[PDB]
Amino acid sequence: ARTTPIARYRNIGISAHIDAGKTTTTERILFYTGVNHKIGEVHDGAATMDWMEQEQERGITITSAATTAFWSGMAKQYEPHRINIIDTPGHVDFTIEVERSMRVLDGAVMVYCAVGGVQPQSETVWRQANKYKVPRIAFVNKMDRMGANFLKVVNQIKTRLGANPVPLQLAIGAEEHFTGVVDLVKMKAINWNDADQGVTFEYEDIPADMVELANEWHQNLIESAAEASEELMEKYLGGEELTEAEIKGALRQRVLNNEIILVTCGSAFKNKGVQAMLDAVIDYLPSPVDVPAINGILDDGKDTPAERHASDDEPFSALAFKIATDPFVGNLTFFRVYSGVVNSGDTVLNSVKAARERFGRIVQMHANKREEIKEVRAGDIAAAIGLKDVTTGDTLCDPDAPIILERMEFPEPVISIAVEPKTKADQEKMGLALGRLAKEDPSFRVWTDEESNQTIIAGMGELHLDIIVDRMKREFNVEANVGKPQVAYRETIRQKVTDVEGKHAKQSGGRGQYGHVVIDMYPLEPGSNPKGYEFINDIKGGVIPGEYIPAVDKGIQEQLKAGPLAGYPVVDMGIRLHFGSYHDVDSSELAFKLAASIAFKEGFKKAKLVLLEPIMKVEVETPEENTGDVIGDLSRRRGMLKGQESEVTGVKIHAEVPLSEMFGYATQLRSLTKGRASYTMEFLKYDEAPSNVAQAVIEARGK
Amino acid sequence: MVTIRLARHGAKKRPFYQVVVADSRNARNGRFIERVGFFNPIASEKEEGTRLDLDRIAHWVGQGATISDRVAALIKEVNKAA
Amino acid sequence: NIKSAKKRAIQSEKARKHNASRRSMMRTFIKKVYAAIEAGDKAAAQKAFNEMQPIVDRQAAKGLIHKNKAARHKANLTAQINKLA
Amino acid sequence: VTSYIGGEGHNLQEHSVILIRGGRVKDLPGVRYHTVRGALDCSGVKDRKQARSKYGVKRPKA
Amino acid sequence: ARYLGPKLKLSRREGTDLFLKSGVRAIDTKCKIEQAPGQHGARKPRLSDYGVQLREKQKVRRIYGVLERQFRNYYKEAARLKGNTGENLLALLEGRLDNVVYRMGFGATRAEARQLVSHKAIMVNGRVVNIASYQVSPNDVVSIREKAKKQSRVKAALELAEQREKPTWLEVDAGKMEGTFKRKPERSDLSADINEHLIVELYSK
RNA sequence: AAAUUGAAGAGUUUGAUCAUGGCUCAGAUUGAACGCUGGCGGCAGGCCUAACACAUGCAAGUCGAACGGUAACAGGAAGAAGCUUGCUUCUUUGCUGACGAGUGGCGGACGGGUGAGUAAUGUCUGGGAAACUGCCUGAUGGAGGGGGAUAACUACUGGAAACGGUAGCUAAUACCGCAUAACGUCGCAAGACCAAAGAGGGGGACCUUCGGGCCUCUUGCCAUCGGAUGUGCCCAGAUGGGAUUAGCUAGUAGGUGGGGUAACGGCUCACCUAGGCGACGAUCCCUAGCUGGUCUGAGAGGAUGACCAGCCACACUGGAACUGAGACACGGUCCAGACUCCUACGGGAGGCAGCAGUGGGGAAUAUUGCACAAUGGGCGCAAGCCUGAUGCAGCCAUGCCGCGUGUAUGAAGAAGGCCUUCGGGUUGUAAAGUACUUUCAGCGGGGAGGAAGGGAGUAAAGUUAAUACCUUUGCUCAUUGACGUUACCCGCAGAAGAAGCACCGGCUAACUCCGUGCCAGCAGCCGCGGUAAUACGGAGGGUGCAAGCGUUAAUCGGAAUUACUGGGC
């Protein structure tokens, strides 16, 4: 039945900063397990994981791709383990993707560069992994590059991220003469062979060049491993050397509770270290049943609603972590079965939305390539064709299973752009493309603001957002150029008050009626009410008929609602009716509303009121070294500031900035802060601003 | 094999077959050489469920016509001896 | 291909080789008879006709050609040889 | 072809896509088609309450 | 598929009595039967040939509780059947199961007969029928089911079933609560106010 | 008995009339779409345009009762694993059930799809001769005898794969010669010539080399004459528009001879004649699958070919053939073209107009579903396997039909709206209130029928030489439904969960007020709106239809408005 035992299943992710060697380390993994005949290089687009045309051309991973392998051992020590590795992206432009893959996986191998070590995206993946408490290990890649030092990278990890790291494999030699690595348990130096592409290696006697630091760190490894149970420490302090098996098990325990991360070193480009990192994935990373079960809520929660041991007998439960786009079926749902068994054709219940979905074609994955499989067992990552409504993060299960799983959080887009196709009448096709790309990606949203015709595109970055437009050009072909959003202004009176009026000679004999109103315009103040329309009834002279006395406020709405000046609504206008004229036969309301309109018009021209811009509450965090640069950038713009606050891990700056300015502020912020700042918009009250554009939007049309 | 088979006419969830002597290549409801009686499967009442045309069926089977399984069963049940 | 109609393809090619061999042998024997009839030596034409006749009857029986085709060959050749005198 | 825009008030700009049906307006010589209101971004006649199946106006609650 | 509204409006629009109410009180005492239902009912619009044909057809439609599609079907069937079209049409309208139920009591109105037929309380010739359009046939025995006998409406309807002309084609046995359908009513066996040729020529236009 | 019983008009040229004459409406119908609304069930329908391009999964396999054989499972056999001479399982033996791959047989030419081409090589109707036909069936016979291979396999080997090489083999219902065959072929005659294959079940002997021989029955093979079916071919009539298409044709029309076809034939070749078709429309151009039938019409007729069924044609475009009874072959071969895909760059694979499904086009047309349980089809002695045929399920008020959204009672004729002559009227028994019912929807419980068959045992005869083994007909046994939480029945709660769409000047059924003021707007036709609009917009009221309604598109009718029936100058 089940091909591989549940213990011999690894669902692992490869997460780190941009270009740390993650996509290569995956190629060398697929090479040392024989599934790909050619090694392939990321720069020459040969990489199988980089299947999208953008990924080939720009040498970046714009998506998560899944693959499988069978790593027996370095000497075939263990039975073949089925490792499901989903390569992930490091660009801040695509963070949903890394968190998306990160949630389901049981372990993470965090790549690092020897030159740089801890980098901004490395802290980002660290915080994402820490919130989901995934057990982690680390690989220091690019040890061949100059400036390489294992020790410094270890110290950077300890000092910055916060973990206390235990070295597992040190490095023999400098950057160019990187022969191989020495393990701190078997006490063997696995020097790799240059002639062949890393497939073979030769074990040596760990020469005296590094025989004292090696012993020291080996001892530190022993001591760190002994902090798993009192039985380890008691024998350790007894003067006897612990056996390798208990050391490895105690380390596996410490990784399981996430106290420590095990750091291995190697260089994928130099075809070295990859076999040892995969070996340490088998030895130390957790299998699905090597942790306690996942929890959930049933019928608005319970004491212990679900503790589903991953097994082939319990009822089916899963999570759809990823949605992809297939032009030929219309969807591609990636799911991890946490506990249960499902098969082709089987129906499931989407617990959150309470509906029925049929699994048409469950398949397994090798990057873009798809291989049909009849059934999926528990703990396996697969893709489900035939799903047409399930959003990212929705639990898919058979009936009487946990309704809601913990995967209920997604980030907020920072960059907002507009887009408009060259031929304007491709709007329906573009809208369909945007709707699909927004349903698949929850961090990309498309809302068409109804003041204008523009389609608003929100994303995590300018890269993100332009990959979402050239991808449209290539697949589901449409040609569209991006631009800037338009302006949503409002108006406030510049402290002017009078008793203006309006009058038209509607009588003429035959017509039979006329209307006149005496109003009193005033503002209240900038931002005391949500309901800008204020009206306190006070009609004294010429009191109108008593069936529609309070009904002379809704008729004023059709002027305040939209468009008195340059097609922009108005806020804070107060009307106060004192006098007028009528005749109590049939005083026509619709032609009495003309007097009020001309009264508003006259009040507007005599008032000389000025335009009000949208200004929001941005809040930014940053390290206490770039405070000057960020505040200088806001000061260069017409931006106010609010809060002298310093956090413990940074500083929270609060600033009031316009909306027509600061277009693409996030990317500039990342540039001037080394990509280590975020922000948010709270849409606070509008503020006055001297603007040469405020009158140019109405003098474009003249009078 | 010129066959004598049921032709499956009628309505949804209530079949009513036509015993037709038709060449075995043509479809079930397709071209036939002759129709020899009907057969109502769902009849469980006084009116006759089935009716055959015994002399023409005998002529055909003497001319080498193949008899289907259900048509053989209806020839059986129609005869009093079986 | 896709299905197991490739077996019929191999059987068809082998049968084409065999049928082409045997049909060519038949046709060369009949060309021999025609050359004899066009030479005018009635005795060689009669011997050639009596040599081709069992060949064509055997193949007509096997099904490589039809009984009508064999009978047409024998009838035409007998008519030719009889008017040859 | 030329085509009428029925109802009271429209929103037809220079590139808006619309559905065209048969008809005639008779007083306009050369207009033999009518714009189907309330279909394909040609919004329905505002504040309409009678003959509402035509002009593409959704049902008020009332 | 059923008019759930004010029946008396219908009656006074046709002017005559459509028998859409029980005999508890007279028709005039419940509605102003003389005038039309509108606020302009007091006035009188001069009739037209199409007007009177439509009004006769609608009077028949409102009496029997039939909709236009079914009534058109009953006219295609009546035209198909040999003999006088209007006579066949009246037979097909009296053949309706709610019609025969009403004419046999058990409901003070044809809408009550529709409720009785629909709520699985009727057995025609043994088989429990609950289809209000069931075309009754000669020698059919209409029986009420158990758990429906002695209910308030059936008792009120049986007592109220008197004071009206007994149909000469039904031969109902009141006490045991079974009735027969010995033969279809002929032309002269009905209201005689219904001008059937008007409807026939309206539907043959 | 009955197979019909069937034919309506109106508005609009005019100051008004009568004719002529056109436009429009009332009806029926749709593979429909759009707008508004939407409860259920049954039966049907569902890419009308791009025969545009297709990812993916299935749409054709089967037979061990043809054969060599053993890859996988099981049963055993010999044991010196495990061991208490084993219940706690080591390998080998096709030995037996079985069976991957292979040789071979049959199917793959059926079923399914589409209408591009085709105006006549097609179809329909009615005949005909110059024909073939696997499987089905009847009649007569034969069914001696032998050989060479060869796949599979073994070895070496090449290739990324696809797929091969090169030697050694090993069978067969694979192939080949001989013998033999005449109411069979050729020949006027005489005469000459042509075939095969065996396998399975059991068994009284009796002989063996436990291979079996031998006796039975069941199938299978070969020849010939028949029938049935299916197919090929020919003739006549009919089957669109254009003369703003009058000449067309050189194998062209025919004859003789040779060749070819299963078969007649310029089908083809070599000569010879100079014919042949055409004003009854040849030739050319555009369009088009044809028919039973569908819609309409009282008919005659007009339009049409969605469903269903028959025939034809096509399978990415063009051409040619092979195997085979049958093809010039959807899911076969070869080539040329274009497209797409895999590649290790050396090469290789494919053709959804099969069922789903995608892109695109379009106003517009469904699920990447469940079973072979029914009936069929292929294979097989069967059991059984396969079948995207078929039976079902899903989506969509797309159509037709049926039902429900309550029923009775109820005058303060409530409030409120609207009109008002200010009296009142209308909304209106309508509501509320009172009494009663629970169809259908929702829960809970019972529950047909579509199921015939097939398998094992048994008995009876038929069978032989044998009560065995095989047919056939009964008796018993366990049984086979995807649909399916089936139809249907019973119970539980309560009127709860269920009404909208168009119109209201005349045609045409149903009128007033308000706001607008030749404006905004309505309209199928006549027309309306420039200060009292039943014609616009809203409100009240009413009329028609109703889970639908209206609009648009299309056909016929009305249209006697192409008038043959049935018109005029």
Ligand SMILES: Nc1nc2c(ncn2[C@@H]2O[C@H](COP(=O)(O)OP(=O)(O)O)[C@@H](O)[C@H]2O)c(=O)[nH]1
């Ligand atoms: N020198 C060197 N270059 C490396 C190494 N690993 C990867 N690279 C290259 O560095 C670049 C970034 O590595 P890549 O795997 O694309 O990173 P990712 O995009 O974050 O997965 C590519 O051009 C790689 O070929 C390494 O160990 N040494």
Ligand SMILES: [Mg+2]
């Ligand atoms: Mg990468």
Ligand SMILES: [Mg+2]
């Ligand atoms: Mg209905």
Ligand SMILES: [Mg+2]
């Ligand atoms: Mg195509």
Ligand SMILES: [Mg+2]
């Ligand atoms: Mg086999």
Ligand SMILES: [Mg+2]
């Ligand atoms: Mg041999």
Ligand SMILES: [Mg+2]
């Ligand atoms: Mg043979």
Ligand SMILES: [Mg+2]
């Ligand atoms: Mg000849």
Ligand SMILES: [Mg+2]
């Ligand atoms: Mg012509």
Ligand SMILES: [Mg+2]
């Ligand atoms: Mg065509």
Ligand SMILES: [Mg+2]
């Ligand atoms: Mg007519």
Ligand SMILES: [Mg+2]
């Ligand atoms: Mg079709």
Ligand SMILES: [Mg+2]
């Ligand atoms: Mg051929």
Ligand SMILES: [Mg+2]
């Ligand atoms: Mg195909």
Ligand SMILES: [Mg+2]
């Ligand atoms: Mg084929």
Ligand SMILES: [Mg+2]
């Ligand atoms: Mg489209």
